[PDB]
Structures are given as structure tokens and as C-alpha cells.
A paper describes a structure:
Here we use a robust deep learning pipeline to design complex folds and soluble analogues of integral membrane proteins. Unique membrane topologies, such as those from G-protein-coupled receptors, are not found in the soluble proteome, and we demonstrate that their structural features can be recapitulated in solution. Biophysical analyses demonstrate the high thermal stability of the designs, and experimental structures show remarkable design accuracy. The soluble analogues were functionalized with native structural motifs, as a proof of concept for bringing membrane protein functions to the soluble proteome, potentially enabling new approaches in drug discovery.
Then, we tested our design approach in one of the most prevalent membrane folds in nature: the GPCR fold. The core topology of GPCRs comprises seven transmembrane helices that facilitate numerous non-local interactions, enabling them to bind to a variety of ligands, including photoreceptors, odours, pheromones, hormones and neurotransmitters. De novo design of GPCR-like folds (GLFs) offers the potential to create new small-molecule receptors and protein scaffolds with functional sites of GPCRs. We tested 56 designs, of which 36 were expressed to be soluble, and we selected the ten most highly expressed designs for further biochemical characterization. Of these ten designs, nine were monodisperse monomers in solution, and all showed the characteristic circular dichroism signature of α-helix-rich proteins. All ten designs also showed high thermal stabilities (Tm > 90 °C). Last, the designed GLFs preserved the canonical seven-helical bundle characteristic of native GPCRs. Structurally, the crystal structures were in very good agreement with the design models, with r.m.s.d.Cα values of 1.05 Å and 0.88 Å for GLF_18 and GLF_32, respectively. This accuracy further extended to the side-chain level, for which comparisons of crystal structures versus design models for GLF_18 and GLF_32 showed 1.54 and 1.40 Å r.m.s.d.fa values, respectively. Comparing the structures of the soluble analogues with that of the reference native GPCR, the overall backbone r.m.s.d.Cα values were 3.08 and 3.51 Å for GLF_18 and GLF_32, respectively.
Numbering used by the authors: 0 to 232
Write the structure that this text describes.
Amino acid sequence: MGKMEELVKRAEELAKEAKEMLEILKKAHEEGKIDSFLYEALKEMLESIKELAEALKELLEHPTGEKHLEALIKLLKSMVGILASMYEIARYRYLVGQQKQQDPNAPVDPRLPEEAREEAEKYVKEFEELVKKLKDSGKLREVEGLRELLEFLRELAEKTLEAAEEYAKLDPDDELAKGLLEAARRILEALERALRAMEETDEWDLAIAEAAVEIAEAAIELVIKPVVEKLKE
Ligand SMILES: [Cl-]
Ligand SMILES: [K+]
Ligand SMILES: [K+]
Ligand SMILES: [K+]
């Protein structure tokens, strides 16, 4: 099989895993076994991984035309969704952990989950606005438009890495923090390689698809799977 076909096979394996983890996490949440904020963010992350695998299949099937651009856009948006859900968890866990350090005697702050969610949702909205702007100018159909979208993803990956770093510095024994940090490192590395690949040749579809699969693999293996495994024990 060609490279793009191998990438779709891998993404479909990840989507299969994601559907199964969604079922396990839902039962765990109904049984009082997982925190609601973490559950809701992992659920969003898994749904982005399912969408990524769908867009990748469409990209393989539509190398040209409007369906090609729509598959590329859907694929990039699902990558943004995975990073924003990672950012949401790291930010929320950090804010809660910081309050414990600065003032352990204070009551639960209701603003913290709302603050983490609002910040992560802003990135999703900003990306949708950027896509619309490039689509209106026509720049979306040129290589410079795709670079601008990948540069946005790289900046989001850097912000996600910073959030994961701050969270991991609070508790070095926190395994979820360690998984978010390593995933954020791999995701940033994958996007920096994709930006390099897009300058070296015209294989733009392969560059983005490769980054997309690496991003979903990192999230599944390093962030989601260990939480699910702990619930199984
Ligand atoms: Cl206090
Ligand atoms: K407190
Ligand atoms: K959301
Ligand atoms: K940690």
C-alpha cells in the first residue's frame, strides 16, 4: 500500500480504539469513577480523533477539487481540537493545583473550570475565523494559506506545551501531567516537521496527514490510554 493508504489504515485503527475508549469512559463516569471535567475533555479529544480519521479517509479519496480542500480543513480542525482539549486539561489541573499551593484553605473556585474551557474554546474559534479569512481571500488554495494554518497549529502546540510544562512542574508524580507533557512535545515536533516537509516538496497532503496521525497517536497512547488503563484496574 502507498503511504497515504497506510496512514488511513493507522487512523482507522485509532478511531476503532477511540470508540472503545469512549464507551469505557462513559461507563466509568456514570459509575462515579472519573472526574467530570477530565471526562468531558477526554470525550472531546476522542471525538476529535474520530473526526480526524474520517477526514483522512476523505483526503485519500479526494486529491483534487473542493472535497480535497474540505477534507484538509476538517483534518486541520480535528488536530486543533485534540490540542485544545489537551490544553484545557493541563490548564484546569494547573489552576486547581496552584490554588492548593497559594491558598489551601479556600473553598472550591467555580470560575476555574469555566476559565480553562473558555481559553481552549477561544483557540477553536480563532482557527475557524482564520480558515474563513483565508477561504475568502483565496489564500486557502495556495501553499501560503496552508502554511498559515500550520503555523497557527504550531503556536497552539507551543501554548499547549507551556501549559503541560507548568502542570507537570506542580506535581512530578502526576502521571496524567507526564503524559500530557510528552504528548505535547511530540505534537509540536510533528508540526515542526510538517512545516519543513511543506517547504521541501509539493507533497502537502502527505505532510499534513502524517502530522495528523502522529498527533492522534500521541494523544491516544500518552494521554487517554493510561487513564483508561487505570480505570480498568
Ligand atoms: Cl488560604
Ligand atoms: K483551596
Ligand atoms: K469545548
Ligand atoms: K507530572
